[PDB]
Amino acid sequence: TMSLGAENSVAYSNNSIAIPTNFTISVTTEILPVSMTKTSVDCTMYICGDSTECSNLLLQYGSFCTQLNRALTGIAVEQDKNTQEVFAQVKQIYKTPQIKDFGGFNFSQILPDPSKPSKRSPIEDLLFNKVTLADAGFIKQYGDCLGDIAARDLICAQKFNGLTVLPPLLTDEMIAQYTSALLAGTITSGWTFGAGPALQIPFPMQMAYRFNGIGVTQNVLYENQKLIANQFNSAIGKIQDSLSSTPSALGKLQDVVNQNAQALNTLVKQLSSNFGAISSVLNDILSRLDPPEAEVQIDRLITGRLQSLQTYVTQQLIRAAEIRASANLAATKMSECVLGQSKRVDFCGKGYHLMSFPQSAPHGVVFLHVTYVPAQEKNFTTAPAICHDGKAHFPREGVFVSNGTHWFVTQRNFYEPQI
Amino acid sequence: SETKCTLKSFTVEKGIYQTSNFRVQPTESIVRFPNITNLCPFGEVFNATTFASVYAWNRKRISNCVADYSVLYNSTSFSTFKCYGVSPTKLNDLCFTNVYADSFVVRGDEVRQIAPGQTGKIADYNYKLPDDFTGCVIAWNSNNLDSKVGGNYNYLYRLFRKSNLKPFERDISTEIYQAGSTPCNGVEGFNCYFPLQSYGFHPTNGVGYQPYRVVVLSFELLNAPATVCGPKKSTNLIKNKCVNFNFNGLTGTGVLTESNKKFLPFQQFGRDIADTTDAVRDPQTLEILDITPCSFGGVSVITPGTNASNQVAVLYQDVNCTEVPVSTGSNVFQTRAGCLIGAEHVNNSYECDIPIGAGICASYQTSQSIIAYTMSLGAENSVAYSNNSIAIPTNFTISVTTEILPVSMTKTSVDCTMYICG
Amino acid sequence: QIDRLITGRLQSLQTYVTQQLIRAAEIRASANLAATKMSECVLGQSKRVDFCGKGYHLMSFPQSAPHGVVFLHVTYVPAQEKNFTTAPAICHDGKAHF
Amino acid sequence: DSTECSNLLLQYGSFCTQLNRALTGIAVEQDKNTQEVFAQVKQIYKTPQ
Amino acid sequence: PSALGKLQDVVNQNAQALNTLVKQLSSNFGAISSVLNDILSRLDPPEAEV
Ligand SMILES: CCCCC/C=C/C/C=C/CCCCCCCC(=O)O
Ligand SMILES: *[C@@H]1O[C@H](CO)[C@@H](O)[C@H](O)[C@H]1NC(C)=O
Ligand SMILES: *[C@@H]1O[C@H](CO)[C@@H](O)[C@H](O)[C@H]1NC(C)=O
Ligand SMILES: *[C@@H]1O[C@H](CO)[C@@H](O)[C@H](O)[C@H]1NC(C)=O
Ligand SMILES: *[C@@H]1O[C@H](CO)[C@@H](O)[C@H](O)[C@H]1NC(C)=O
Ligand SMILES: *[C@@H]1O[C@H](CO)[C@@H](O)[C@H](O)[C@H]1NC(C)=O
Ligand SMILES: *[C@@H]1O[C@H](CO)[C@@H](O)[C@H](O)[C@H]1NC(C)=O
Ligand SMILES: *[C@@H]1O[C@H](CO)[C@@H](O)[C@H](O)[C@H]1NC(C)=O
Ligand SMILES: *[C@@H]1O[C@H](CO)[C@@H](O)[C@H](O)[C@H]1NC(C)=O
Ligand SMILES: *[C@@H]1O[C@H](CO)[C@@H](O)[C@H](O)[C@H]1NC(C)=O
Ligand SMILES: *[C@@H]1O[C@H](CO)[C@@H](O)[C@H](O)[C@H]1NC(C)=O
Ligand SMILES: *[C@@H]1O[C@H](CO)[C@@H](O)[C@H](O)[C@H]1NC(C)=O
């Protein structure tokens, strides 16, 4: 019997309270698809295969062919606009500043590294390496497939039958530039450049504004600036370690790639079936039978192959709907987690949210979310409302607690003994 | 014009407009058959001095011959000719694998029973054909040879059997057949019958009671090697060009190239996962050749509107800007998306107008011409980071924008009967 | 012959209905987004970033249209600025003031 | 359960495999839906007196 | 009574789809009958293939 989890309990006491003495800064990872592969189909090459007797009988189905091609064109344009909406929010490229002291904060690993091609971050480099792509570009020449007959590579097989893959408009370097501009803007000007021109501000000031956002006073930072900066450095180290240690991290992107490849390959394999005809080869039928008797078999084959193409197109449309929903969610999370700080619960990370960073990926994006989680706690005694002189007095911002002889007021997300 | 025909309109807007593919046409035709010189034994097979009885029918093997059936035109006249797995007009262009010939004599009104799916005396107890039969059936009258004034009784047929025969099986037993429950133990009597019976042919009997001679041919057409071929002259072998070929009756078009795979002695050609022929063994020089399609594809056309101009640019997805692998005027440019012909490359970067691919866009501008360029992401900028320096705005602006969202779509209903039958 | 025609025409009708279903799903997603936009920008002031306008949000007005709706978002944008000098706090009598 | 049929269905077993893959995907999706709605917390808290 | 409608609609939709799938077996798609046993009883293989 599967275990739901470790059974636990909370002791309800109406004259007691627990307030967190300490806290942690934790960073997690999140993976979302953005776009799929774009494809187009030639009817005549897939159905008739360079036969003149065929394709003189396909003049009665060219209309269905036009409909299929229209649907595929719509899908391709949709993929392009999905990438635009996710990554092209800002048209002002913000150059990465000369790496300055940020108070211990270390964006060296998320910022581009000049001493390598394409000027991309080491974490992005690892993410690019982890996911495999079965395309290797689109430059396959006729001589390349003609010479390599012995190696039955699948790409030549699906390209000899009218199935081709079109390249996306935005190259990888362009997307890296977009992400670099986003990171530079968000590390210099804070949240300002989302609404109006960017205004310069120290990083300690911006993240002290973040603490004031979550409801924790600035003094918690100010008395412990170096400790908290070291804490964030430790969190980003934990993220690099977690990404490097476990190969099985990026699954959804790989699943998208594998699904597209499998769909094309099964379309290729379905040419071996005869749909009640004497054979699955047009050449054999045309070699053995006269035209009035060959027309029947050719018609059966044409009907079957059109049915296969229609099934492929329908599946592609449904998958496009799913990816559209994911892309819209990615755009919303980008806007609400890197252009501002969200009060929503469990949206930009588990816990009280601080900020987020994007990293590029093939067919998707990876979000590094920086959250707040309280550490160990200590129980205390309280009163429903501290009445001093007959008029119920209430604290403005904290909660009144006592050790047993003295009364102090303190807030909720962190322990702050104050009078 | 191709995109005009695809859109079924005489006006075309701007775009990229995927065309069909790249195609190449054959220029030559070749024929390769094995060298046979001897004519095929028609005179022995059709034209024997004696023929067998239907129950003890005869089988003969035919190999290493040329099937020119035009030599029978002045010799024979046929009353029945029907083929099953092949069209009679394609017999001059084929080669046949495992030919056999069967021959016997029957009545006139029993020739209809030599066909698949039949029932009757001959089909049940004498001669049976398979349901999936491939071959031809021939018959002709023989009253002037197999009839005598007194009566000819040499031909025999079977009358009684306990069970029906399986296809292409023969029995020549002479055991006594029992009809009643009384055991026979030999000695034909009241309920015991001799199974075989004799035809009686006279020169003055009816048309359905006259003898007929039947020959049945069976074979397999394409798979496996063949040694019997039609009367077609052979040609020379052409390699590394798109030609029309005919290898042992198999027709197609493609490019032939030497191969490394080795066949077993009982194999002639091979197939791939799609069940298409990709290799073949030459009948004359025993060598292995591969077959590759001629058309490969990847073409698209870039144009402004037809109202504006009639200039176009064409994109080939997979070419290192040379002659197109199986029309360069002045401008050739190379991109990661492919070779672009008909545009002028420019160093300046503008806003994207018509998306080409791999970070290249096109536009129409000033004498007007089509240009291609790397798309501009936007205006380069930077922000100074200075922590001891903070900046706060002293004016603001109040602005209004517009947002457009669809809500509903049209409601429609369909009547099946009026749309389909009407 | 009549059976061939019947089968073809049924196939055409089924294809039409499938495309209609997919389009209806997309339109329903748009309609839900529009309903939330109304409820959260016209009946209230939203704190979400880039949801009810390009900048700090003030309000929004609805306008009708055939098969749709048009939203007019009134937004705050900061104009020209000036640089100054800042420090984390001020130590006046030894105790940091923030 | 006719043997003459399903000897002629070897030409369409591929389409059958495709259909079955789609249905299996739907089933796994339903299980994940229920888990994503109801399994937010892993510490099972017991109701007090 | 008319409070929990959407859940019941889901259940009804699934059941009705399965029942319609069962009922569609009564149609003959241009054949002489919708029963395989009937066709196999009256006709030989080369004619029953169609
Ligand atoms: C010796 C018998 C034939 C052996 C070789 C034949 C192989 C395959 C048969 C092809 C058909 C042509 C041969 C029979 C003549 C047809 C009758 C006619 O001409 O009307
Ligand atoms: C707490 O509960 C106890 C009994 O359980 C009761 O006597 C007391 O008045 C309560 N106090 C408050 C502040 O709820
Ligand atoms: C709070 O937790 C961090 C995390 O390890 C630790 O380094 C720090 O000492 C803790 N502070 C206190 C006061 O316990
Ligand atoms: C932290 O920053 C220093 C530069 O001061 C750099 O050398 C080091 O590699 C960084 N550590 C990271 C990015 O983990
Ligand atoms: C509670 O805090 C005060 C500090 O003002 C301390 O003097 C007192 O002893 C504490 N109570 C206990 C029980 O330790
Ligand atoms: C056919 O003739 C060629 C010479 O023209 C010879 O090399 C070959 O072995 C011959 N083979 C057959 C099939 O007769
Ligand atoms: C054809 O056959 C007839 C009768 O046997 C004969 O007279 C005639 O010469 C033949 N023709 C040829 C061209 O051999
Ligand atoms: C059979 O062959 C003989 C020669 O042996 C010839 O005289 C006769 O006409 C032939 N018969 C037919 C009908 O071919
Ligand atoms: C084959 O032999 C068996 C055993 O004698 C017999 O019962 C059967 O009928 C035979 N087959 C035919 C077609 O007669
Ligand atoms: C063209 O040829 C060069 C040199 O072989 C090669 O680097 C390049 O990838 C080829 N294709 C394109 C798209 O330029
Ligand atoms: C800011 O950083 C510089 C070093 O880059 C340092 O000299 C200065 O004192 C710091 N001041 C503030 C306001 O953080
Ligand atoms: C800036 O603010 C002043 C004071 O309200 C105003 O008079 C001036 O018009 C503002 N600037 C613009 C461009 O309106």
Coordinates of C-alpha atoms in Angstrom, one line a residue, chain A residues 193-332:
Chain A
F193 CA 12.3 49.0 -16.1
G194 CA 9.1 47.1 -16.4
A195 CA 7.1 50.3 -15.8
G196 CA 8.9 53.2 -17.3
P197 CA 12.5 54.0 -17.8
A198 CA 15.1 52.1 -15.8
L199 CA 16.4 53.9 -12.6
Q200 CA 19.7 53.0 -11.1
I201 CA 19.8 51.6 -7.6
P202 CA 22.2 49.5 -5.5
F203 CA 21.5 45.7 -5.3
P204 CA 21.4 45.9 -1.4
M205 CA 18.8 48.6 -1.7
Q206 CA 16.7 46.6 -4.2
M207 CA 16.7 43.5 -2.1
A208 CA 16.1 45.5 1.1
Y209 CA 13.1 46.7 -0.8
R210 CA 12.3 43.0 -1.4
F211 CA 12.4 42.4 2.4
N212 CA 10.2 45.3 3.0
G213 CA 7.9 43.7 0.4
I214 CA 7.6 40.4 2.1
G215 CA 6.6 42.1 5.3
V216 CA 9.9 41.8 7.2
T217 CA 11.5 45.1 8.3
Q218 CA 14.8 46.3 6.9
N219 CA 16.7 45.9 10.1
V220 CA 16.7 42.2 9.8
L221 CA 18.9 42.7 6.7
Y222 CA 20.8 45.6 8.0
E223 CA 22.1 43.8 11.2
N224 CA 22.8 40.7 9.0
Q225 CA 23.8 42.0 5.6
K226 CA 27.0 39.9 5.1
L227 CA 25.3 36.7 6.5
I228 CA 22.3 37.0 4.1
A229 CA 24.6 37.8 1.1
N230 CA 26.6 34.7 2.0
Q231 CA 23.3 32.8 2.3
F232 CA 22.2 33.7 -1.3
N233 CA 25.7 32.7 -2.5
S234 CA 25.2 29.4 -0.8
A235 CA 21.8 29.0 -2.4
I236 CA 23.2 29.6 -5.9
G237 CA 26.0 27.1 -5.1
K238 CA 23.3 24.6 -4.1
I239 CA 21.6 25.1 -7.4
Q240 CA 24.8 24.6 -9.4
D241 CA 25.5 21.4 -7.5
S242 CA 21.9 20.1 -7.9
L243 CA 22.0 20.7 -11.7
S244 CA 25.5 19.2 -12.1
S245 CA 24.9 16.1 -9.9
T246 CA 21.6 14.7 -11.4
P247 CA 21.5 14.0 -15.2
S248 CA 17.8 13.3 -15.1
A249 CA 16.6 16.8 -14.8
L250 CA 15.3 18.1 -18.1
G251 CA 12.4 15.8 -19.1
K252 CA 9.6 17.8 -20.6
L253 CA 11.8 19.3 -23.4
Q254 CA 13.3 15.9 -24.3
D255 CA 9.8 14.5 -24.3
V256 CA 8.6 17.1 -26.8
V257 CA 11.6 16.4 -29.1
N258 CA 11.0 12.6 -28.9
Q259 CA 7.3 13.0 -29.6
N260 CA 7.9 15.0 -32.7
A261 CA 10.5 12.5 -34.0
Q262 CA 8.3 9.5 -33.2
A263 CA 5.4 11.1 -35.1
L264 CA 7.5 11.6 -38.2
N265 CA 9.0 8.1 -38.1
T266 CA 5.6 6.4 -37.7
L267 CA 4.3 8.4 -40.6
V268 CA 7.2 7.0 -42.6
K269 CA 6.6 3.4 -41.5
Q270 CA 2.9 3.5 -42.3
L271 CA 3.7 3.3 -46.1
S272 CA 4.1 -0.4 -45.9
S273 CA 0.4 -1.2 -45.4
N274 CA -1.9 -2.1 -48.2
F275 CA -5.5 -0.9 -47.7
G276 CA -7.1 -3.9 -49.3
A277 CA -5.0 -3.6 -52.5
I278 CA -3.0 -6.4 -54.0
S279 CA 0.3 -4.7 -53.1
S280 CA 1.7 -1.6 -51.3
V281 CA 4.0 -0.7 -54.2
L282 CA 2.7 1.4 -57.1
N283 CA 5.5 0.2 -59.4
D284 CA 4.4 -3.5 -59.0
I285 CA 0.7 -2.6 -59.7
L286 CA 1.7 -0.6 -62.8
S287 CA 3.9 -3.4 -64.0
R288 CA 1.3 -6.1 -63.7
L289 CA -2.0 -4.4 -64.6
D290 CA -3.6 -2.3 -67.3
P291 CA -4.9 1.2 -66.4
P292 CA -8.6 0.4 -66.1
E293 CA -7.7 -2.3 -63.6
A294 CA -4.9 -0.4 -61.9
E295 CA -7.1 2.6 -61.1
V296 CA -9.0 0.7 -58.4
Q297 CA -5.9 -0.3 -56.5
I298 CA -4.4 3.1 -56.9
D299 CA -7.6 4.7 -55.5
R300 CA -7.5 2.5 -52.4
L301 CA -3.9 3.5 -51.8
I302 CA -4.6 7.2 -52.3
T303 CA -7.5 7.0 -49.8
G304 CA -5.4 5.3 -47.1
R305 CA -2.5 7.7 -47.4
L306 CA -4.8 10.8 -47.2
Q307 CA -6.3 9.3 -44.1
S308 CA -2.8 8.9 -42.5
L309 CA -1.9 12.5 -43.3
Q310 CA -5.1 13.8 -41.8
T311 CA -4.5 11.9 -38.6
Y312 CA -1.0 13.4 -38.3
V313 CA -2.4 16.9 -38.8
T314 CA -5.1 16.5 -36.1
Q315 CA -2.5 15.2 -33.5
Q316 CA -0.3 18.2 -34.3
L317 CA -3.1 20.7 -33.8
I318 CA -3.9 19.3 -30.3
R319 CA -0.3 19.3 -29.3
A320 CA 0.0 22.9 -30.5
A321 CA -2.9 23.8 -28.2
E322 CA -1.1 22.3 -25.2
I323 CA 2.2 24.1 -26.0
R324 CA 0.2 27.4 -26.5
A325 CA -1.1 27.1 -22.9
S326 CA 2.4 26.4 -21.6
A327 CA 3.8 29.4 -23.5
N328 CA 1.1 31.7 -22.1
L329 CA 1.9 30.5 -18.6
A330 CA 5.6 31.1 -19.2
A331 CA 5.0 34.7 -20.4
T332 CA 2.8 35.4 -17.4

